[PDB]
Amino acid sequence: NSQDRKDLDKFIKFFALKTVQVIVQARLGEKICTRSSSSPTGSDWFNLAIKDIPEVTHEAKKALAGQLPAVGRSMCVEISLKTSEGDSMELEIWCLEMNEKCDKEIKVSYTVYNRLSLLLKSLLAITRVTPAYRLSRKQEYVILYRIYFGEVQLSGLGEGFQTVRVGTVGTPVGTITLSCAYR
Amino acid sequence: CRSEVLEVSVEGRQVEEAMLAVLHTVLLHRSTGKFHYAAAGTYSIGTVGTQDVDCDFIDFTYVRVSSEELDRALRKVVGEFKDALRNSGGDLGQMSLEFYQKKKSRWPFSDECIPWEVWTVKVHVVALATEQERQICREKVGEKLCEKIINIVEVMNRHEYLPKMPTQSEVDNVFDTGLRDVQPYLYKISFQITDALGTSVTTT
């Protein structure tokens, strides 16, 4: 069980690293396009071609501080807008929680691994069908991103924000939940 | 075998992109990297690429797997539906995307195609007459397609059932291994121009 969780920690770590890439690249103003490979490389996580932006990797690792989501401790990617006036506005908070309840029957490694791959595919899809997407590409305005870690605070979204469930994946340590709250 | 039905009300020119948006979204979730088997029975899994598709007739962008041949296959049968829709008229069509496994059967009976999941997108085409028609339509169906993709993701995340991983000989009973850059689950795309059925009882 010790190796399996060492593997699962790695899977969750790189899932979190990769969701931050997907979310930020989708708020990047330009279209994203990667290529499949029948002869892949050893760093195509979850059988998906997601190019890491170093600077984004940096503060994904500074935010996590070498830690992983858990109880009451959930990773958040905040997409914001600074206008010509300079007043900030919280557009979306992307939330990767790690619920308490577990799935002791789900067989690590690659059941979880393959289901996290599907969730990154769901995340690629949902990241283009929220209003902050079309806003981030129609470019006057600028988009800001920021990653932090703990309890989630939805206050800057304003009263009445909507939420989108991206999906969930159950693991023996708890079930991951990926969602978004946006104004 | 589970079924999901979606409806879109779209202008005539936007029917192709709206369908590609639905089909690709489903197939992105219903495919994996290609399998390369070893004689020992193990296999490696290739990498899937994805790319953004900007719609012109709709203010909308979807994500499809970067296979150029899969896109050509769907654009073709989407065009078959497009042509059939305009050849017919009035009392309106629907396209279906179904996933199935191939089961072996004793001679003489040929192999059984057993659906585990089917998607039907019913299409209502509306006619437009000013230019404000076209522009506000470009906005309106884009917002509608956002709802659809969100609903597709939220049924896809149910993790209801999926066929078990095939062995080297069973692979062509579960996957479409005929493509270069992705192996979808074995799928079938048929369409159908239906009639319009009224409504009986309120139930007020």
Curated annotation (Swiss-Prot), chain A:
Residues 122-129 are annotated as: Important for interaction with ATG101. Phosphorylated by ULK1, ULK2 and mTOR. Phosphorylation status depends on nutrient-rich conditions; dephosphorylated during starvation or following treatment with rapamycin. It is found in: Cytoplasm, Cytosol; Preautophagosomal structure. Changing R128D: Abolishes interaction with ATG101. The LIR motif (LC3-interacting region) is required for the interaction with the ATG8 family proteins GABARAP, GABARAPL, GABARAPL2, and MAP1LC3A. Autophagy factor required for autophagosome formation and mitophagy. Target of the TOR kinase signaling pathway that regulates autophagy through the control of the phosphorylation status of ATG13 and ULK1, and the regulation of the ATG13-ULK1-RB1CC1 complex. Through its regulation of ULK1 activity, plays a role in the regulation of the kinase activity of mTORC1 and cell proliferation. Part of a complex consisting of ATG13, ULK1 and RB1CC1. Interacts with ATG101. Interacts with ULK1 (via C-terminus); this interaction is increased in the absence of TMEM39A. Interacts with ULK2 (via C-terminus). Interacts (via the LIR motif) with GABARAP, GABARAPL, GABARAPL2. Interacts (via the LIR motif) with MAP1LC3A, MAP1LC3B and MAP1LC3C. Interacts with TAB2 and TAB3. Interacts with C9orf72. Interacts with RB1CC1; this interaction is increased in the absence of TMEM39A. Belongs to the ATG13 family. Metazoan subfamily. This is Autophagy-related protein 13. It comes from Homo sapiens. The gene is ATG13.
UniProtKB/Swiss-Prot annotation, chain B:
Changing V153D: Abolishes interaction with ATG13. Signal peptide: none annotated. GO terms for cellular component: Atg1/ULK1 kinase complex; cytosol; endoplasmic reticulum membrane; phagophore assembly site. The keyword Cytoplasm applies. InterPro entries: ATG101. It is found in: Cytoplasm; Preautophagosomal structure. GO terms for biological process: autophagosome assembly; negative regulation of cell population proliferation; positive regulation of autophagy. The keyword Cytoplasm applies. Its main location: cytoplasm. GO terms for molecular function: identical protein binding; protein kinase binding; protein-containing complex binding. Changing I149D: Abolishes interaction with ATG13. Residues 149-153 are annotated as: Important for interaction with ATG13. Changing H29S: Impairs interaction with ATG13. Keywords: Autophagy, Cytoplasm. Interacts with ATG13. Associates with a complex composed of ATG13, ULK1 and RB1CC1; the association with this complex requires the presence of ATG13. Autophagy factor required for autophagosome formation. Stabilizes ATG13, protecting it from proteasomal degradation. Belongs to the ATG101 family. This is Autophagy-related protein 101. It comes from Homo sapiens (Human).
